[PDB]
């Protein structure tokens, strides 16, 4: 199912964003963000992302980091670009 592929990609993207925000306390992040842009444009609100909460805690059981982390995919990718430039 292609929608299950989309939701698994977004879940993995959110988990990996949490782990990258954890890893960087401040070059591989820049190459990771572009790695999640060729994917996104190959595929091509705030409430849209809350439905992913439970499936993200399945693999990353951290309420604090998920709360700190917070069309909608372009907003998150712009946030990732802004974090990579800094």
């Amino acid at each position, epitope marked *: 199912k292609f929608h*299950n592929f989309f*939701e*698994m990609w977004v*879940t993995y993207l959110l988990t990996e964003t949490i782990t990258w925000k954890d890893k960087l306390k401040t070059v591989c992040f820049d190459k990771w963000v572009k790695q999640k842009e060729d994917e996104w444009n190959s595929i091509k609100i705030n409430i849209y992302f*809350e*439905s*992913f*909460f*439970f*499936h993200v*805690m*399945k693999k990353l*059981n*951290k*309420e*604090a980091k*998920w*709360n700190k982390l*917070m069309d909608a995919i372009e907003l998150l990718l712009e946030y990732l670009k802004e974090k990579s430039t800094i």
Partner: antibody, heavy 122, light 111 residues
């Protein structure tokens, strides 16, 4: 505002199979993570299993690994139950409840069902 | 033991604060937290505290929860004589992948 309404109680016999179904509404069906809780009369709750309705991921309890099965039906937005081996002391009121509030970002059994009190007897 | 151990019952008077305890291990309660549940006689258990100890909608500010590290606590200040309910602590075990419920203290007001 997610609402959970619980099916009526059913009287079973030992060795039969029970089916507890509660439908959930109030948002997208993708973002539902309801769990099934057993409370025998006279003592406390006992978590049986849960389903996260996004990628069809069910986690069972250790003692209900080979007994209970949980599935979801996205057309009617219902969550099903099944107990293959019903035994005499498996008498309880069965609840379904999501395990968190996604708007707040926290895990907790927030909204609960009415309760399907399956009573096995002879 | 690896579950959630809770005292069987606690009894406090009216207009008094009630102190709770629910101790697990580094996986059940110490890891992220524990949720507190209010169950009356023959009623579905209403939640009072999330794992981060937030107040859900429909619950007043009279309740309050916290965690002293590897032990969850829930405080009820000024017991109301119609607060006869059994209170449960739940906590997602990360080693067994299970919500673990405690025994559940029974609250009896004195009046």
């Amino acid at each position: 505002q997610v609402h959970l309404v619980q099916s009526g109680a059913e009287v079973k016999k030992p060795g039969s199979s029970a089916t507890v179904s509660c439908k959930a509404s109030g948002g997208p069906f993708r973002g539902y993570s309801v769990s099934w809780v057993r409370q025998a009369p006279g003592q406390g709750l006992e978590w049986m299993g849960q389903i996260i309705t996004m990628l069809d991921t069910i986690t069972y309890a250790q003692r209900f690994q080979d007994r209970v099965t949980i599935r979801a039906d996205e057309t009617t937005s219902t969550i099903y139950m099944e107990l293959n081996s019903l035994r005499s002391e498996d008498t309880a009121i069965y609840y379904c409840a999501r395990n968190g509030n996604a708007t707040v970002g926290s895990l907790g059994m927030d909204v609960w069902g009415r309760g399907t009190t399956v009573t096995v007897s002879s | 033991q690896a579950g959630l151990t809770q005292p069987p019952s606690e009894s406090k008077g009216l207009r008094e604060t009630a102190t709770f305890t629910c101790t697990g291990n580094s996986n059940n309660v110490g890891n992220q937290g524990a949720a507190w549940l209010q169950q009356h006689q023959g009623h579905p258990p209403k939640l009072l505290s999330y794992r981060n100890n937030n107040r859900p909608s429909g619950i007043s500010e009279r309740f309050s929860a916290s965690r002293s590290g590897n032990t969850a606590s829930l405080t009820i200040t000024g017991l109301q004589p119609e607060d006869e309910a059994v209170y449960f602590c739940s906590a997602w075990d990360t080693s067994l992948r299970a919500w673990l419920f405690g025994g559940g203290t029974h609250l009896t007001v004195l009046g």
